[PDB]
Design a protein around this ligand. Sequence first.
Ligand code: MG
Ligand code: ZN
Ligand code: ZN
Ligand code: ZN
Lengths: 116, 528, 96, 189, 60, 66, 86, 56
Amino acid sequence: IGRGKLGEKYITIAEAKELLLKRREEEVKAGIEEPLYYEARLALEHAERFAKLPADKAKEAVEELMNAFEWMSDRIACKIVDIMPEDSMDLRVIFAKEEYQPTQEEMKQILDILDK
Amino acid sequence: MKKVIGSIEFGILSPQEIRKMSAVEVTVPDTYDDDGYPIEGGVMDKRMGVIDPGLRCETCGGRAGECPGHFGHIELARPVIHVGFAKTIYRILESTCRECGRIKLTDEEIEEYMKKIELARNRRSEFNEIIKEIHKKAKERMVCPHCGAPQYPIKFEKPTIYWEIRKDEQGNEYRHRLMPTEVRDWLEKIPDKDLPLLGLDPEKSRPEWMVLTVLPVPPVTARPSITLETGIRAEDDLTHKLVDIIRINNRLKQNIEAGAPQLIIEDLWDLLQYHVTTYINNEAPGVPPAKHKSGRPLKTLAQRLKGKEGRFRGNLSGKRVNFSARTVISPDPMISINEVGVPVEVAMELTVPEKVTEFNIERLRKMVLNGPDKYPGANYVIDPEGRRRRIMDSNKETLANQLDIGWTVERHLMDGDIVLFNRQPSLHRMSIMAHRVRVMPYRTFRLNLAVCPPYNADFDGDEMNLHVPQTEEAQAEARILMEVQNHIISPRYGGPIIGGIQDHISGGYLLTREGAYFTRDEVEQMLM
Amino acid sequence: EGGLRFGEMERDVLVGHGAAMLLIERLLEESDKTEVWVCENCGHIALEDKRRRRVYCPVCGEEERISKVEMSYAFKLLLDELKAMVIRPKLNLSER
Amino acid sequence: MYKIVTVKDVVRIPPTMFTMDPKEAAKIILRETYEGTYDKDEGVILSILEVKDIKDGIIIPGDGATYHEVVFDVLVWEPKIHEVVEGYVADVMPFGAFIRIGPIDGLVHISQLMDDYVVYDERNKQFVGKEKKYLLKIGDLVRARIINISAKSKVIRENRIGLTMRQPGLGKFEWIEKEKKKEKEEGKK
Amino acid sequence: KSSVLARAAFEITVQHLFEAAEKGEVDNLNGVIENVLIGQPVPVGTGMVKLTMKLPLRPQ
Amino acid sequence: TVAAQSIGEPSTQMTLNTFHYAGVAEINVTLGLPRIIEIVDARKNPSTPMMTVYLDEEHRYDRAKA
Amino acid sequence: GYRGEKYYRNLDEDGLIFPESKVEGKDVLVGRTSPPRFQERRETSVAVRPSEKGVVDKVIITETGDGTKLVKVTVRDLRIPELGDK
Amino acid sequence: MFKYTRFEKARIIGARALQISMGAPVLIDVPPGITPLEAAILEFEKGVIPITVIRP
Ligand SMILES: [Mg+2]
Ligand SMILES: [Zn+2]
Ligand SMILES: [Zn+2]
Ligand SMILES: [Zn+2]
């Protein structure tokens, strides 16, 4: 990427399936033979494999995870929203992805939020 | 997306950098083999590049033109002294100490010199004055302040020879001949904190690097070989000198390994040092220039850069140019002062690239149809892709039809085109001006006579040069800045320069003299 | 079929007129056009690899930043000739 | 993994596009240049969403086009080591399973497939279970941690991603269900 | 003159080059001669003019 | 550059060989091109150092006092 | 290195130009092929200067001092006075 | 504008001529057969100029 970085935003795959669909409609109404360029429908299949999470409700789950506890970074909430670790052992598994393993009552409230 | 060179920082090279930069070590002192096929490890090794057609290099491959050329290296058996840095080496040796390698300066003197040297370090002259003062103060000392050792005086000889007077019995101070090895050991021990006091930075100029251990070999393209009448393949003098170095240091390595009497080793060391000295600078004072077979001194790197015909001036400052012509000048008062009569033959050869747009498609199409033999025609046509075609009678119609927006046509010169007109020598600014083109049948440039005083030209055999700008910005600059009518007033004294000469003044006097009268027919004819 | 000589005096004349782009066109554009890659920390001429399709710094071992710069053939040869001696010219790059 | 960043840059607008609005032309040019390319420090550039604002142009000598500084945002799938990725497996090869981890496909080595002795199918060519008979199907997704990031060049297809499967919590959804049943049995006892 | 190349082009090229190498001087290329050597626009006359333009050109 | 050319172009016109004859009531001084070269090169001492001594109010109108 | 066919258009079969023939520039006067040593044959013909023109006046065949052959050809050109002549 | 020096006028005309040659449309009707440069001069003389100059 070019000179200067002006920030970043971590967004769920359900938060970009609709962006890929915007590209889809734009290109087809443009008359392009390919509904979208290379490396993009391959990502669209991955998006639609777990596209069952509503994008807006996904972001609601994110913001509830931010306001639930302070050690939360939007990438973590993104992956929890993507994978739905309703099983406690699975949430220990993502806890291992993190550098540390916090309190499991926090995992109770992640289970609460995941039911959105 | 391209970048430009904003600044250049000069520095001295290092043996490690030489080793990393080079792609081959040249050990075989041979240039060429039978039927070409350069000897591997020779002075013409294909690793450094390829010059002749039909062969590829190995580092980057490609045609002879495609290969930019790559550097080699030669690892010398024993260190030698660089010619250019000889005087600096002498000053460093006679200023710094021998044991600790520190300058012969007191700590408080070092502190005050540090304070003043940074202050206003921009100017070069004061910097050199401070350097000379420090050098003198260091030289005047006898015993090093840091260690109580007698710094014996050191002497210098013009062909890079140092033989200090080492302490002898009864203080005779016998002049021990210094060798580059012990000089290298002397220089390496010098610390880096006081390096600025010696006029040296601690990054791109290390005193140890000042003495050679491995030297590079210029790429084969940098040392081209020109085939003579009988295919002699006479190479550049640099190649011959390199062959000499390789043979000499090969034999030096052999007698070093054999452990022969060290006198022969010293003699070979001196021969190698002299050869390297000639390679760096063939004209360096104190050495005999190395002439070629016909008694002509070789033009090494130093002479290659310097001189009127050297690299720096006469090769980048000025060069031969394309799209130019030269012929004699004849007078013509019937054209405007901002026009030049151009022979039709020159117009057919010189061309101006024109991009095909909407408002000139018709004219360009017609002129392409004219071909390259009728006057209002073209020579080459450039398609939008980039490939360039040549106009011929077989493909005139097809090329004319294929012409469209975005194409480029190399048309002949036309009336109204802008060109550059110059006469040498170019004493002042007005020696080059821009005139509009007007094509004429014969073979001489036609220049209006009122424009003679600027060029300082007379029609007694003088010759003038004509230049045709090719890019639109160049054409606009020539049209707006250097038009003839814009330079009527001279910038030397603020008066007119392009005025009447000779017959103009005399005929004016004849016309407006007292008693002059003209009839009806004369009046009408002269007014028309 | 040689070309005419555009000496130093003509260069000073063209400078005196103040035509920079005309000077560029007469000097560099129509003779010895060149392109060269250089690494952005040493300034040494980066060595492209036709085999690996990748540019790199042989002295520096760098591939993260390599830029392509236009220059004259005479200047490239002068840099080579300076590097023939112990002179090391370090090029600092800038963006327009 | 999907993420959007905001980056400033300068765009070269050719004179042919001098009659349209600057924003649309800048979007087209950016789509041409920064798209379908894997950045070494960022990941695979996927799509330019929209250019936030565009400045004026600078006429560089010798070019004739206008260079405009611009700020814009792009969505990029960014790989990162030591993370779980839920990708479609495919193109299983006797050295490694090829997991469609997004725009790029990741590699799962035969040994990484399973804790048991290294096994891979020959006739059926997906998976032969020597001891635990745990099998993998191409049409089935699996979730896998990352062991290495391959960052070679700007192009995507050259690079790959190494994913492990031995670690607990990762496997075929059938294997995950079996492990969950084992955990439930252990916790109920 | 601060520029090394400018001084070298005039006279005594080799000595000036070696002296600059010793001192480790830096050439900022702010003169006519250096820009001519590298083939970049000289900073006099038209070489100092800077231009901008509004993109949405209306042919009218 | 304009100033340099304006000083240099007329330089091809003055006589390098001046009169070399002071005559009467004059002192010979280098003229033409050599004088200009000496001025430009700022030689530590000129070829013909000649001074000009204007008189004060007294001794100016009186030849004998002159 | 074989140039255009039109360039060798007035040479006799022995490789020498016919006297009193018209040449106009870049036309071959003596056809000569050199050994490929720097299965081919380099073309090393002697041709008129690119910008000149005239008529062949005389052709001389001699044996040089070394025993090899030597050929000298002279081309005459008419020069009517025109603009620029001194 | 306020006043155009010789160098600024030359620069503007050159830039406009280059743009016209590379494919930019002309905002003034022009006679047929004209070169791009003379079209630029006609455009400048008419007074329609789309390129402004930046002063320190
Ligand atoms: Mg004369
Ligand atoms: Zn090569
Ligand atoms: Zn000491
Ligand atoms: Zn480097």
